[PDB]
């Protein structure tokens, strides 16, 4: 963001970060599963505060 040009940034990005992996180690995709929201409470009682 700011005083940059997209083509110069693309040329630098290619020439530097063209060797980032894209290939998996164990070929097992880490899924980003849904999370279960739980209605509950937590109460830490500290009267010295």
């Amino acid at each position: 963001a700011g005083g940059v040009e997209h083509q110069q940034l693309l040329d630098l990005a290619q020439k530097h970060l063209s060797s980032v992996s894209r290939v998996y180690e164990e070929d097992a995709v880490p899924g980003l599963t849904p999370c279960r929201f739980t209605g509950s409470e937590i109460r830490h009682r500290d009267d010295a505060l």
């Binding site: 209605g39 509950s40 009267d47």
Partner: protein, 72 residues
Amino acid sequence: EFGNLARIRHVISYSLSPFEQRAFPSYFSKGIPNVLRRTRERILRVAPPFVVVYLIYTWGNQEFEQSKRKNP
């Protein structure tokens, strides 16, 4: 009145929503042993006076019935 009853430090409490949990979670399977345990803890303090006064009641009724009878 709430807020000035006691001084409590380093205590954490965890709960659930009443809509998030079962009403009767393992009711019989955890309720029959616990009721049996409370019964085992309290029968030797509660029951024997009542057994003794049961015998007093039965003895008094039979002694009243025998005193009703005409002695030959």
